[PDB]
Write a protein that binds this ligand. Structure first.
Ligand SMILES: CCCCCCCCCCCCCCCCC[C@H](O)OC[C@@H](COP(=O)([O-])OCC[N+](C)(C)C)O[C@@H](O)CCCCCCCCCCCCCCC
Ligand SMILES: CC(C)CCC[C@@H](C)[C@H]1CC[C@H]2[C@@H]3CC=C4C[C@@H](OC(=O)CCC(=O)O)CC[C@]4(C)[C@H]3CC[C@]12C
Ligand SMILES: CCCCCCCCCCCCCCCC(=O)O
Ligand SMILES: CCCCCCCCCCCCCCCC(=O)O
Ligand SMILES: CCCCCCCCCCCCCCCC(=O)O
Ligand SMILES: CCCCCCCCCCCCCCCC(=O)O
Ligand SMILES: CCCCCCCCCCCCCCCC(=O)O
Ligand SMILES: CCCCCCCCCCCCCCCC(=O)O
Ligand SMILES: CCCCCCCCCCCCCCCC(=O)O
Ligand SMILES: CCCCCCCCCCCCCCCC(=O)O
Ligand SMILES: CCCCCCCCCCCCCCCC(=O)O
Ligand SMILES: CCCCCCCCCCCCCCCC(=O)O
Ligand SMILES: CCCCCCCCCCCCCCCC(=O)O
Ligand SMILES: CCCCCCCCCCCCCCCC(=O)O
Ligand SMILES: CCCCCCCCCCCCCCCC(=O)O
Ligand SMILES: *[C@@H]1O[C@H](CO)[C@@H](O)[C@H](O)[C@H]1NC(C)=O
Ligand SMILES: *[C@@H]1O[C@H](CO)[C@@H](O)[C@H](O)[C@H]1NC(C)=O
Lengths: 339, 128, 227, 373, 55, 32
């Protein structure tokens, strides 16, 4: 039948791509960075601790000013923090308590949140009256909202559990672009330094690079063994790191179209929940289910430090735009700032 | 690239025997629990049997208990299913399903309609 | 110069904190419940007693209960089921091979590393339907489970005067299938509360209320290292 | 003048006039022979006794060193005259055995004296460590720990005033003989902090009862009434006791324990501990009913029901209820003193070890925080 | 399905006809970036206490 | 508080005091 013909036509195309990638693997990243000096032991300490939330924190996002950050806990609250003074700037009661993601607009005027309600709600923080009201509700996803990221005040890309990513247009509430390549639940997404491309990681152990404007899947990155939970672009925009349930982090290169480095240890058997780079991309911070956050040498694949302050599963972690501090969220209601 | 290709299968007469094979690649075969699932014509995906990471803990569905035998070869990264005393109710497409996370006792979503980490399946027809 | 902002920011912070203490009183007073059931099971019939999740609020003896139905979601639960790791109990509605599929789903919930401290309330909601097919010749419980011919009614069984001894043996065999998974992995962290539902009784919220009271009691006994 | 000798010599003159007044009430002796004549020796009373017989009466209690449990003896010889001491050739009464065992009595009193100091010194050591853990680690913070913190603070302050009272006041003879007010303020805060220690065991029992038996679903039991019951209420019986002591029974440094005015403090204290004993009965009853619903083995059901009963004894003060009265037998009374002083002075050490050190959820958060550093 | 399997092939030809540079060239640019920005990284090179707003 | 359990420390202080501080009764020739 033609179904077996399409499977055979796809099976050989998989061999054509696999052999084209092997031809480019002339030297690994561990061989190019063999003579560089190690970064040494990284010892960060908990500078701040945020204790406002009443339940497990699922997501957090820094503002572009590196001072304000928004967190999302499943108690039904969206709290905006002043990391310097530890004060709470806003507390937003959510209609649905099962929030799974939160985002901060680069202009600092709006915040987004989504979860099991299958809605991406936008909250205006700069209203004339002063109070924070829900400005828009984006409906159309047939699965839970996993991640959302503002491109600007009027555009936002969302990943959902319906195996689909969507590019929304605020002020109209309509999907302008739909990304349907993935076969499993998309769990994370990361915008490049420019807002023209973004990567997504789904539960099919695969990562896909998307063009925002054209709505096409340019490249597909495999190599993981289990569900990809986290993803983050390199500061230069030519690579990205993924975190999966196979207890490993992997570095993929866009131009090389293959995996470059694997960050794993035998003493690590828990999944990775969050990944983030430094301002220079030399360090790779990953949150684990063992209540700790390991700091990896992105160029040498050697653990450079441990962030063990949290008492429960580290759900989220984010680095400021100036690389000055690292915020980590946990399934304990507390959020810790590291430096 | 997690890959699962099921071999074997074919047309068997009722009362015969058959051996299904599942070749795995792209992941540490010893760290994962493995399953067998089938889909009868006009029915949904039904769980058949599973086996632990080492091979000690083994479970079957009541319909095939005492007839089917599941076994794994971690050195060869292959899963087996010896199907004895086949009857026409066993006619289905048998899939090799791996549940997603390693070192976990829970084994989720193997019988989902659109589920990754599951092979394309092999046709097993028990006809006269 | 900047003391005007650092004081106005500390004033709004205290206004936020006084509101969060009113939320902490409401959030900790209500008990959250996860309603989990297949398609054939009468899951919506339990609510008697599009949206990505359905919320129903009821009150039993001045105690607030917030039950959540997971609708408009795919059958791949391994990712969003981790959100319900702090609920009081998971309501599991089973229809009495859909029975084997429910035994595997309860096995995955029971042995999940994030749901191993979450108790499960079990409801077999097709007792009236099971009572018609067991005494007839279309029960289908002997072919799907060959170990049923070797099974006898337990001594702890409570047979009602309106059910035949075969349904009593049949419904207690299905209950022993779910209790076999609970006893194999239960180490005092979470428990299973199986109940028989004939879908004609409105006393199911009294069973949830009584089972959630046993869960909170066992959680308090565990904090004092008494149980 | 000491109040003990004043009260002793006061009734001594009253008891002296009483017996000779009873001598007129007592009829004439009809027994034959040279019966020795009845008289008052100046301490006790001997009636008409036949010759060649020894009379035995309990030792009087006018003097501090005199023990009423001991037996005095008086002999009037068969010739008809009382036994006379050969030193002075005058009638003499053998009160020796009333004061002969004072070195042995003081020996056992010092064994319990240092057992009390060691018990309260070991308590303060482990309790500040335990209280320092609950204040340091915010993770452990809850309503159970907030009440445990005040329960630990009562043990520390109680053991502190007891240690101060035991080295500066009790063994100092000239301090008590002068009787300054410094004793009475120290004895007032001693009785107040001792009552707060007993009434915070009740707050722990009330909170345990209204968490497992009564009102299981209720959340955030307001701790305002626990503070008035634990810290505030023990001020009412302690103030009333100090008033009636300064007015009616006032003595040197308030060390005497014989007055019935102490039931103003220890009446409400024993009642508060009986309520805790019945809370323990309901908590264990609920506990064994939960193991029967689990179909637990009867051997391990008894193993965990006894272990749960044994860890709630130091927290609720059950040792005061199961052994509330001291026996009169010399052997049984001696073991009672050793068993009770060990369960009372080491009580703060038992609670700090059971509920802070041997607590699983505290060991994990300490081991984790130590694994970081 | 069958229609979803035809777009599986259509997507594979789009990803197979792309230009891929060598890994040695892609790994050198990643290494050259972390060295040109190494000093501007407060997490790699800790800034003094007078420059750390989280002191 | 003579034999009561919650007053055994007040009894220990009482017997220790009156046995040690107050002098021993003579209980000798010329005394009763
Ligand atoms: C996390 C796990 C932690 C585990 C911790 C475990 C801790 C275990 C602790 C065990 C504690 C056992 C206490 C035993 C007490 C025995 C007292 C003993 O019987 O006293 C005898 C007495 C004899 O006097 P005397 O000679 O007849 O008349 C003398 C008369 N005359 C004084 C006038 C001259 O006293 C003598 O031995 C001298 C005094 C000895 C005791 C001093 C007490 C005060 C100082 C204590 C310092 C240490 C405190 C902490 C101890 C842990
Ligand atoms: C014997 C001498 C020391 C005189 C007796 C003094 C006590 C009667 C005082 C001293 C310290 C007081 C305590 C200080 C603080 C608290 C915490 C307070 O609870 C709180 O959480 C208050 C707010 C906070 O601690 O931030 C309840 C009262 C209590 C136990 C107080 C009870 C009364 C105490 C023990
Ligand atoms: C943590 C608090 C510790 C308090 C320790 C108090 C010790 C008091 C010791 C008093 C000893 C009196 C007798 C001294 C002479 C002797 O040993 O015979
Ligand atoms: C253990 C911590 C608390 C200790 C409390 C000690 C209280 C001592 C009080 C002494 C009062 C002395 C009054 C003297 C009056 C006067 O000069 O006449
Ligand atoms: C505020 C609480 C008060 C509790 C009072 C409980 C009862 C106390 C009774 C005390 C009676 C004292 C009688 C003394 C007689 C005497 O000394 O001769
Ligand atoms: C909270 C502290 C309370 C302290 C209470 C102390 C009470 C002392 C009372 C002394 C009374 C002296 C005069 C008595 C006169 C009389 O006999 O009527
Ligand atoms: C904070 C107040 C503490 C009070 C401590 C007890 C004080 C007792 C005072 C006793 C003497 C009072 C005056 C004489 C009374 C009398 O002779 O009846
Ligand atoms: C309100 C709490 C109880 C108060 C009880 C007060 C009792 C006063 C009357 C009885 C005692 C009279 C004085 C006795 C003096 C003595 O012990 O010798
Ligand atoms: C709720 C607590 C109640 C406590 C009751 C305590 C009662 C103590 C009674 C002591 C004796 C009172 C009568 C003394 C008569 C006398 O000797 O003159
Ligand atoms: C329920 C709490 C009770 C607290 C007090 C219990 C006292 C028990 C011992 C009483 C002994 C006799 C007291 C009266 C003596 C007398 O009138 O001569
Ligand atoms: C001498 C004063 C003693 C006062 C003792 C007060 C004891 C109060 C106990 C309250 C328990 C909680 C409320 C009742 C619960 C129930 O009905 O069992
Ligand atoms: C030296 C400390 C002695 C402590 C004695 C505590 C006695 C507790 C008795 C508990 C068992 C009796 C009640 C059982 C109730 C039930 O089984 O329902
Ligand atoms: C829970 C049951 C009661 C437990 C004990 C409560 C306190 C009892 C105190 C009095 C004990 C007996 C005293 C007898 C005195 C006498 O006979 O002269
Ligand atoms: C947890 C409480 C433990 C209590 C341990 C008490 C140990 C000593 C008990 C008394 C022993 C005999 C003392 C007198 C011996 C003698 O007659 O010479
Ligand atoms: C939990 C701590 C328990 C401590 C128990 C200590 C028991 C000490 C017993 C000492 C008995 C001394 C007997 C002396 C007899 C004599 O010589 O007259
Ligand atoms: C004492 O002895 C008897 C008591 O019956 C009495 O008659 C006698 O007169 C008294 N003798 C003296 C010397 O007091
Ligand atoms: C008193 O009795 C003791 C023995 O109990 C004896 O040694 C002593 O001699 C007696 N007193 C007189 C004065 O005889």
């Amino acid at each position: 039948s033609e179904l077996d013909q399409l499977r055979q036509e796809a099976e050989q195309l998989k061999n054509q791509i696999r052999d084209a990638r092997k031809a480019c693997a002339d030297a690994t990243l561990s061989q190019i960075t063999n003579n560089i000096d190690p970064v040494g032991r990284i010892q960060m300490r908990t500078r701040r601790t945020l204790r406002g939330h009443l339940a497990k924190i699922y997501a957090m996002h820094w503002g572009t000013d590196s001072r304000l950050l928004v967190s999302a806990s499943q108690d039904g609250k969206l709290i905006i923090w002043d990391s310097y003074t530890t004060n709470k700037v806003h507390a937003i009661p959510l209609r649905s308590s099962w929030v799974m993601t939160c985002a901060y607009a680069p202009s600092g005027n709006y915040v987004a949140c989504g979860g099991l309600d299958n809605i991406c709600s936008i909250y205006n923080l700069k209203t004339r009256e002063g109070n924070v009201r829900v400005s828009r509700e984006l409906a159309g996803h047939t699965g839970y909202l996993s991640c959302c990221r503002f491109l600007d005040d009027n555009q936002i890309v969302t990943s959902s559990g319906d195996t689909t990513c969507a590019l929304w247009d605020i002020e109209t509430g309509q999907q302008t672009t739909t990304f349907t390549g993935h076969t499993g639940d998309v769990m994370s997404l990361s915008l490049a330094p420019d807002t023209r491309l973004f990567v997504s990681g789904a539960c099919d152990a695969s990562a896909k690079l998307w063009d925002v404007r054209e709505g096409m899947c340019r490249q597909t990155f495999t190599g993981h063994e289990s569900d990809i939970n986290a993803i983050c672009f390199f500061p230069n925009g030519n690579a990205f790191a993924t975190g999966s349930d196979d207890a490993t982090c992997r570095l993929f290169d866009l131009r090389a179209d293959q995996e470059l480095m694997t960050y794993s240890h035998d003493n690590i058997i828990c999944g990775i929940t969050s990944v983030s780079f430094s301002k220079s991309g030399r360090l790779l911070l990953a949150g684990y289910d063992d209540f700790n956050c390991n700091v990896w040498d992105a160029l040498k694949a050697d653990r450079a430090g441990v962030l063990a302050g949290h008492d429960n599963r580290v759900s989220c972690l984010g680095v400021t735009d100036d690389g000055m501090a690292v915020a980590t969220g946990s399934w304990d209601s507390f959020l810790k700032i590291w430096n | 690239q997690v890959q699962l290709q099921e071999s074997g299968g074919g047309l068997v007469q009722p009362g015969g025997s058959l051996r299904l094979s599942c070749a795995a690649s792209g992941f540490t075969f010893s760290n994962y629990k493995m399953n067998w699932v089938r889909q009868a014509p006009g029915k949904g995906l039904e769980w058949v049997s599973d086996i632990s990471q080492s091979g000690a803990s083994i479970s079957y569905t009541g319909s095939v208990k005492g007839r089917f035998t599941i076994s794994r070869d971690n050195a060869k990264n292959t899963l087996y299913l010896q199907m004895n005393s086949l009857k026409p109710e066993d006619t289905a497409v048998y899939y090799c399903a791996r549940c997603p996370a390693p070192f976990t006792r829970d084994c989720f979503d193997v019988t989902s309609t659109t589920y990754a980490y599951r092979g394309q399946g092999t046709q097993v027809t028990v006809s006269s | 110069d900047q003391r005007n902002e650092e004081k106005a920011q500390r004033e709004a912070n205290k206004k936020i904190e006084k509101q969060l203490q009113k939320d902490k009183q409401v959030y900790r007073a209500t008990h959250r419940l996860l309603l989990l059931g297949a398609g054939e099971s009468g899951k919506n019939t339990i609510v008697k007693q599009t949206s990505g999740i359905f919320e129903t609020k009821f009150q039993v003896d001045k105690v607030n209960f917030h039950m959540f139905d997971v609708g408009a979601q795919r059958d791949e639960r391994r990712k969003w089921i981790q959100c319900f790791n702090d609920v009081t109990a998971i309501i599991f509605v089973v229809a009495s091979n859909r029975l084997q599929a429910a035994l595997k789903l309860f096995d995955s919930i029971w042995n999940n590393k994030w749901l191993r401290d979450t108790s499960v309330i079990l409801f077999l909601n097709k007792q009236d339907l099971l009572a018609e097919k067991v005494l007839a010749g279309k029960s289908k419980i002997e072919d799907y489970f060959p170990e049923f011919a070797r099974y006898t009614t337990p001594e702890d069984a409570t047979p009602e005067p309106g059910e035949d001894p075969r349904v009593t043996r049949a419904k207690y065999f299905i209950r022993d299938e779910f209790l076999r998974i609970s006893t194999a992995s239960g180490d005092g962290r979470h428990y299973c509360y199986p109940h028989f539902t004939c879908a004609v009784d409105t006393e199911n919220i009294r069973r949830v209320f009584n089972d959630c009271r046993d869960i909170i009691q066992r959680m308090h006994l565990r904090q004092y290292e008494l149980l | 003048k000491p109040f003990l000798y004043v009260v002793g010599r006061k009734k001594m003159m009253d008891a002296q006039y009483k017996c000779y007044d009873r001598m007129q009430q007592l009829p004439a002796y009809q027994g034959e022979g040279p019966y020795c004549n009845r008289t008052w020796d100046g301490w006790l009373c001997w009636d008409d006794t036949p010759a060649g017989v020894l009379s035995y009466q309990f030792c009087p209690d006018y003097f501090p060193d005199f023990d009423p449990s001991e037996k005095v003896t008086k002999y009037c010889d068969e010739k008809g005259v009382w036994f006379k001491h050969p030193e002075n050739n005058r009638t003499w009464s053998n009160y020796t055995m009333c004061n002969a065992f004072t070195p042995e009595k003081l020996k056992n009193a010092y064994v319990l004296y240092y057992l009390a100091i060691v018990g309260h010194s070991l308590s303060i050591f482990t309790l500040v460590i335990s209280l320092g853990i609950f204040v340091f680690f915010r993770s452990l913070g809850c309503q159970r720990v907030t009440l445990h913190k005040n329960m630990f603070l009562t043990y520390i302050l109680n053991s502190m005033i007891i240690i101060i009272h035991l080295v500066e006041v009790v063994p100092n003879g000239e301090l008590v003989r002068r009787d300054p007010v410094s004793c009475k303020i120290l004895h007032f805060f001693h009785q107040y902090m001792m009552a707060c220690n007993y009434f915070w065991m009740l707050c722990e029992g009330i909170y345990l009862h209204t968490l497992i038996v009564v009102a299981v679903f209720t959340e955030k039991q307001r701790l305002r009434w626990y503070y008035l019951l634990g810290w505030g209420f023990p001020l009412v019986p302690t103030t009333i006791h100090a008033i009636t002591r300064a007015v009616y029974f006032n003595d040197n440094c308030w060390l005497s324990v014989e007055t019935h005015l102490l039931y103003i403090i220890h009446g409400p204290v024993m009642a508060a501990l009986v309520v805790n004993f019945f809370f323990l009965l309901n908590i264990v009853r609920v506990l064994v009913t939960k193991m029967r619903e689990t179909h637990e083995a009867e051997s391990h059901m008894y193993l965990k029901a006894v272990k749960a009963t044994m860890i709630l004894v130091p927290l609720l003060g059950i040792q005061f209820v199961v052994f509330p009265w001291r026996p009169s037998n010399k052997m049984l009374g001696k073991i009672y003193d050793y068993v009770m002083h060990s369960l009372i002075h080491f009580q703060g050490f038992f609670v700090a070890t059971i509920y802070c050190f041997c607590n699983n959820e505290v060991q994990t958060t300490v081991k984790r925080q130590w694994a970081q550093f | 399905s069958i229609a979803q399997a035809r777009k599986l092939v259509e997507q594979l030809k789009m990803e197979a006809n792309i230009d891929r540079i060598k890994v040695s060239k892609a790994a050198a640019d990643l290494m050259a970036y972390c060295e040109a920005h190494a000093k501007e990284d407060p997490l790699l090179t800790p800034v003094p206490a007078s420059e750390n707003p989280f002191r | 508080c003579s034999n009561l359990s919650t007053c055994v420390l007040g009894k220990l202080s009482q017997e220790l005091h009156k046995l040690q501080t107050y002098p021993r009764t003579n209980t000798g020739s010329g005394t009763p």
